[PDB]
Design a protein around this ligand. Structure first.
Ligand SMILES: Nc1ncnc2c1ncn2[C@@H]1O[C@H](COP(=O)(O)OP(=O)(O)OP(=O)(O)O)[C@@H](O)[C@H]1O
Ligand SMILES: Nc1ncnc2c1ncn2[C@@H]1O[C@H](COP(=O)(O)OP(=O)(O)OP(=O)(O)O)[C@@H](O)[C@H]1O
Ligand SMILES: [Mg+2]
Ligand SMILES: [Mg+2]
Lengths: 473, 485, 485
């Protein structure tokens, strides 16, 4: 019928050259297959060398290939199954399951390469996306269909902060989530999957809420630079089909740029500034632009960021930040004070922190909180040297005020119910703004500081103050 | 198989295509493939031809059919583009139906000769006080907007457009100033929301939008500035005035260095090709003031450049500065201290400002720029805490008052008539006595004092646009009397 | 034949390009008329590029070459223990032919996501500054990064020696076979390194894969993978194997050489794009197999040599990104006396307590604290006694806590001997003792316990924990010795 065959003519590293029949060469970015003792080899088209010969990039090992072997053409770019059947399933860049849970019985299969939504389909107004964390909605809110930067490695409970956003949104917006790992450490990938089954974000017997698509580091650049697109595709499905506020997690956006750099390196393309690929600028957009809010649904991206040599002048970071709308930083010094999550109020900033966006009230309320903490950070010197008595009636007041606000930021994670044992809470933007608004006015100066630690709601704050005081009697 | 107007694709990759044939094709001539993708013969060799791809190479297969357009790449130009959003090709992307173009112009036009030109002399109120006082812009000037990420680079260009509404709604034509915004390498949402703000302020009626998103192929971002330029050149030749803003040219060069490196070209500084200068050069030159014989039309340009860590010594930046007629640097430090717009008077410059500035401002603001320049030198030299003399201290008190007076909120454009009064007080020193925390409220309260009382002065500076020897005295006695109370 | 044979078209730079072998596999071995063998890494339509394992003086033009039909393979199994083999796996010590239990391909795929377990089995290195501060786990990838002549090998070397505590025992799930991978080191060095392990009776369970600098580049390329398989054997069969790559830096250089000579695209610092794929496909091979897989485990200690502390370099950045922690070493710290000079500030471990004995964890949780505050108040130590008492207390501890970590080379201590020293340090029973006698303190203190409180030490060795009873018994025994001292 329509069987397309070719023959390998060149093998150089992850770069393989196949020869097809005249006027029958598959287009570019397609998917070629080769028979291998393990399973099969996948080759993504890249260039048409000429003379009925095309150059593709290997998506797996190339050791063993021999000049002449047949090469099948799927005819279309790499495909990944889409649907509720991917939830709670480990999927690789090729789109095949590796969780040993059998084949993913899906109805449809979308390609990894998709054109960015049109200008007319774009929204004309940015709205805030209620997450479920006071430290977020009040300080650095998440933009609906925007890009958020997550800083800080292990030790700050990064993983714990991720599974959280997946639960909250699943209960408030009921939108699923998609985790994508580019050059993910096989070690961490294991502990992640397992942890997710312990928290409840992923249930085998019941219903999962988030789909996993890891791209091991021991994989060739070809696959590494496509992992992101694989996870994006699955997410766009629930945006255009079910129209949900899906969250796409990428860890880490840095290895995605590195991946491209190795690929473009082998192809022969000349190295740009700092060594990165010239095409870097366009690639970044072929991923960030696809993540937006449409008239049907929306996709919010929560991707980590790595700063090469603690330098922001570097192209990779420079280019990434150009799309970021908010940044949730996770400092060690924050979790050191017993503050969970370890979100840093000072570093966490958002491009939707204006009165023309969150309202004049929300604005002023958030601004005062930052002002209270800012002046408190500078007093952390004269206080630990000459005592606290070294403050005026107005200074000493704000100081005792900040002590409550900083602690009040903390929030019990509903996902870490089996970890701590304490019932988690889901604070809404409606109550959050009203909470701090009443603290600033100074309506709880007689209330103990411990009454604001790990408090779900303002109403619960007083509920705890009464218990602590009763136990003292 | 006519190897004279059509050929076959020999190879494709890296965004370039080598077609065989097309013996009657012109240099840099638009073309189309079997898939419908438009290209351009950037180079001609014996036995083959180089074509750039304006779309994804996925759609270009090896061995397809290639037809020629017979005309160089051009874009629809006319008054019908007003209120309409198009791309690099000139096609509508908003979905309000096809564009009503009066004609078609080449994408690559040569700048007007030396003879058919005149020095700029027509002020262009930006609405910003600190701007139209230190580094004013005139019809036909090329004012650069350099600054780091999130410093308010577009915030100065955007407010300018909204302030033009004061003359665009008038009857007279020579007063109106059309606007043409250019977005290249930006996000979809970023532009969409940008358009929405224009509609809220009802400024889209007299503005044209050209799109070159990052998702779009590099070349689109490369040709976007040139084409968008021709859109506004039309108004110039018709004796009208236009205003085009590139946001931003720095990304373009990056997009171009891509095709530059892909086509195997010896790398230069920061991996930019040696011909990167001719890029922005050929583009800016097409913005000037024509002679009266031409139509007395003009084309003001506002290119934007993004630097790193406040480095104006970079390559791309300097290349632009050696073309534009002045810069408006936006330091981040001043931006965080509240000082917004964060205009750094130290690096800000205007090569043809006084020539195109209102005489009412030239009189009240004398040597204000140089003073501020020397201000930061003595201010940053006394910030150690050391005690100084009366001479340096006196200049240090007056400098601070002026610095705070330059500050201004966004979306709050002020008439020249309203700006003149504020500058006068600063130089004289009436503000010196005034508390530092009362400088803001004072401005809003001082303007009301003139409207409620000395309104006649406002109406005189409006029409005349110059302060006579008599009005100068009536003004002094009117401010001094207010400073006392 | 032309299909199983080929003719040398050109030879040089240890790389000869042959014509023919139309059925040869990728990275497959081949044999020349002379006897020297090579493997084809590049498979071109016309010719085939093949690297050499020996001098290119043997290979001539037109010479005949035949296939081997086998990929780079090395013999694995328990027979290697106590031997010294080269990259290929041949004997070089002169102890006779090797007795392997099978072969494994140089290139093996890392264990999948599912067949693994969170590391939980500690790898006692016998280094106080390590097992206390940066704990290592069976299956972890801890990186030994540091400048030249800093003590990188010392760390690993002591680790191996510290294994006589379990390998000469009876239980297998407790032992740990050591596989050292000499890359780019002169023979004299290897011959000595080996001679040290023998004088300590460590060769009984150590495998040396020597890859001297004089040997062909590819040998230095395959060495790490060769040795990798050898250890995996132990891992697959349900055991424990420790492999130390010393050093990966030299490996990359070798690989760079082959890649350049073969005319492959040069990247940052002349390293091909697949250089990262090299180490990532090596380190990921070591892990912790689950209970179903055999509970086997392979630990990796890769060594990287920086150039003046530059951890920002290409190669280091790659390695540091893949591993799971670093044992950064600085020459400066070495000069002061702090040996091994393990920068506590930088040295980190992502697994941490997960793989550390609870007997030591109970006294180490706090030791990271004091040291942390010590580095912050280290400048004060240089000033007069005008320092308040609060900060002064920190200095008293730090000086002594830092003095305790100083451990002589070739002198590993068991956990039963570490806990007593850490416990006395943390509480502060040494603060009264002079900072000059801290060294002899360890000697006389250990000998004391092993004669009067031997029952306590042995309970810590077996239980691995410290009950409220021991915590009190240990404290009483300490205060008693400090008193009599
Ligand atoms: N005069 C001002 N007063 C207060 N806020 C301002 C002022 N000017 C700009 N801003 C704020 O700065 C924010 C950043 O937007 P802006 O476009 O000014 O930055 P930019 O440097 O132009 O960014 P880009 O160059 O990427 O477009 C705006 O959302 C605006 O609210
Ligand atoms: N713990 C220690 N105690 C005393 N001396 C030590 C210790 N560790 C290392 N040395 C000294 O270090 C020298 C060799 O250091 P080492 O081999 O550990 O560094 P290296 O990482 O191998 O550097 P190179 O890359 O040059 O081999 C020897 O002369 C020895 O005296
Ligand atoms: Mg801007
Ligand atoms: Mg060494």
């Amino acid at each position: 019928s329509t069987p397309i065959t070719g023959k390998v003519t060149a093998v150089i590293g992850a770069i393989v050259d196949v020869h097809f029949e005249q006027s029958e060469l598959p287009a570019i970015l397609n998917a070629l297959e080769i028979k291998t003792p393990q399973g099969k080899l996948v080759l993504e088209v890249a260039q048409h060398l000429g003379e009925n010969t095309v150059r593709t990039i290997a998506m797996d090992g190339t050791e063993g290939l021999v000049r002449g072997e047949k090469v099948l053409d799927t005819g279309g770019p790499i495909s990944v199954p889409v649907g509720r059947e991917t939830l709670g399933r480990i999927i690789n860049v090729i789109g095949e399951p590796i969780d040993e849970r059998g084949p993913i019985k899906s109805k449809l299969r979308k390609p990894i390469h998709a054109d960015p939504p049109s200008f007319a389909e774009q929204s004309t107004s940015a709205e805030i996306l209620e997450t479920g964390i006071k430290v977020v909605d009040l300080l650095a809110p998440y933009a609906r269909g925007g890009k958020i930067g997550l800083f800080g490695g292990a030790g700050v409970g990064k993983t714990v902060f991720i599974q959280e956003l997946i639960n909250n949104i699943a209960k408030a917006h009921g939108g699923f989530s998609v985790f994508t790992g580019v050059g993910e450490r096989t070690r961490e990938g294991n502990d992640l999957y397992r942890e997710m089954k312990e928290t409840g974000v992923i249930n085998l017997e019941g219903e999962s809420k988030v789909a996993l698509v890891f791209g091991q580091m021991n994989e060739p650049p070809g696959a590494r630079a496509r992992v992101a697109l694989t996870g994006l595709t699955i997410a766009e499905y629930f945006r255009d089909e079910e129209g949900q506020d899906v969250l796409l997690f990428i860890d880490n956006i840095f290895r995605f740029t590195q991946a491209g750099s190795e690929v473009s390196a082998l192809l022969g393309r000349i190295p740009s500034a700092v060594g990165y690929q010239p095409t870097l600028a366009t690639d970044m957009g072929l991923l960030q632009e696809r993540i937006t809010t449409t008239k049907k649904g929306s996709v919010t991206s929560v991707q980590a960021v790595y700063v090469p040599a603690d330098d922001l002048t570097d192209p990779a970071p420079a280019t990434t930040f150009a799309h970021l709308d908010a940044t949730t930083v996770l400092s060690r010094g924050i979790s050191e004070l017993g503050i969970y999550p370890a979100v840093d109020p000072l570093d966490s900033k958002s491009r939707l922190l204006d009165a023309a966006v969150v309202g004049q009230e929300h604005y002023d309320v958030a601004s005062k909180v930052q002002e209270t903490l800012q002046t408190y950070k500078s007093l952390q010197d004269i206080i630990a040297i000459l005592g606290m008595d070294e403050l005026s009636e107005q200074d000493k007041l704000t100081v005792e005020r900040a002590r409550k606000i900083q602690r009040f930021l903390s929030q019990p994670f509903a996902v870490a119910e089996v970890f701590t044992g304490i019932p988690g809470k889901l604070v809404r933007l409606k109550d959050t703004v009203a909470s701090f608004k009443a603290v600033l006015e100074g309506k709880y100066d007689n209330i103990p500081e411990h009454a604001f630690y790990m408090v779900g709601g303002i109403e619960d704050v007083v509920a705890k103050a009464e218990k602590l005081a009763a136990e003292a009697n | 198989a006519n190897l004279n107007e059509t050929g076959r694709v020999l190879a494709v990759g890296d965004g370039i295509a080598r077609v065989f044939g097309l013996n009657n094709i012109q240099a840099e001539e638009l073309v189309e493939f079997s898939s419908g993708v438009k290209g351009m013969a950037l180079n001609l060799e014996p036995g083959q031809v180089g074509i750039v791809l304006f779309g994804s190479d996925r759609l270009v297969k090896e061995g397809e059919l290639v037809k020629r357009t017979g005309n160089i790449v051009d874009v629809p130009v006319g008054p019908g583009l007003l209120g309409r959003v198009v791309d690099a090709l000139g096609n509508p992307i908003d979905g309000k139906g096809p564009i009503d173009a009066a004609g078609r112009s080449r994408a690559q036009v040569k700048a007007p000769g030396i003879l058919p030109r005149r020095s700029v002399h027509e002020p262009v109120q930006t609405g910003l006080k600190a701007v139209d006082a230190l580094v004013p812009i005139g019809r036909g000037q090329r004012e650069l907007i350099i600054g780091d990420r999130q410093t308010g680079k577009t915030a100065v260009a955007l407010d300018t457009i909204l302030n033009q509404k004061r003359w665009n709604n008038g009857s007279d034509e020579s007063k109106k100033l059309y606007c043409v915004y250019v977005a290249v390498g930006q996000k979809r949402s970023t532009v969409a929301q940008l358009v929405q703000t224009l509609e809220q302020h009802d400024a889209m009626k007299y503005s044209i939008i050209v799109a070159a998103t990052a998702s779009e192929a590099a070349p689109l971002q490369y040709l976007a500035p040139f084409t968008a330029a021709s859109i506004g050149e039309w108004f110039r030749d018709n004796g009208k005035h236009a205003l085009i803003v590139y946001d931003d040219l720095s990304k373009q060069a990056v997009a171009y260095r891509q095709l530059s490196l892909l086509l195997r070209r010896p790398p230069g500084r920061e991996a930019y090709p040696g011909d990167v200068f001719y890029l922005h050069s050929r583009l800016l030159e097409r913005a000037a003031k024509l002679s009266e014989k031409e139509g007395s039309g003009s084309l003001t340009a506002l290119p934007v450049i993004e630097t790193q860590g406040g480095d104006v010594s970079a390559y791309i930046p300097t290349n632009v500065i050696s073309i534009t007629d002045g810069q408006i640097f936006l330091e981040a430090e001043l931006f965080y201290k509240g000082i917004r717009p964060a205009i750094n008077v130290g690096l800000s410059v205007s090569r043809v400002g006084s020539a195109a500035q209102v005489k009412a401002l030239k009189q009240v603001a004398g040597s204000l720029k140089l003073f501020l320049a020397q201000y930061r030198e003595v201010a940053a030299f006394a910030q150690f805490g050391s005690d100084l003399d009366a001479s340096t201290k006196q200049t240090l008190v007056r400098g601070e008052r002026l610095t705070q007076l330059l500050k201004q909120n966004q979306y709050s454009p002020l008439a020249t008539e309203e700006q003149v009064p504020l500058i006068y007080a600063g130089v004289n020193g009436h503000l010196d006595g005034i508390e530092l925390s009362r400088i803001g409220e004072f401005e809003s309260s001082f303007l009301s004092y003139l409207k409620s009382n000395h309104n006649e002065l406002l109406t005189e500076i409006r029409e005349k646009g110059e302060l006579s020897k008599e009005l100068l005295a009536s003004l002094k006695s009117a401010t001094e009397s207010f400073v006392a109370t």
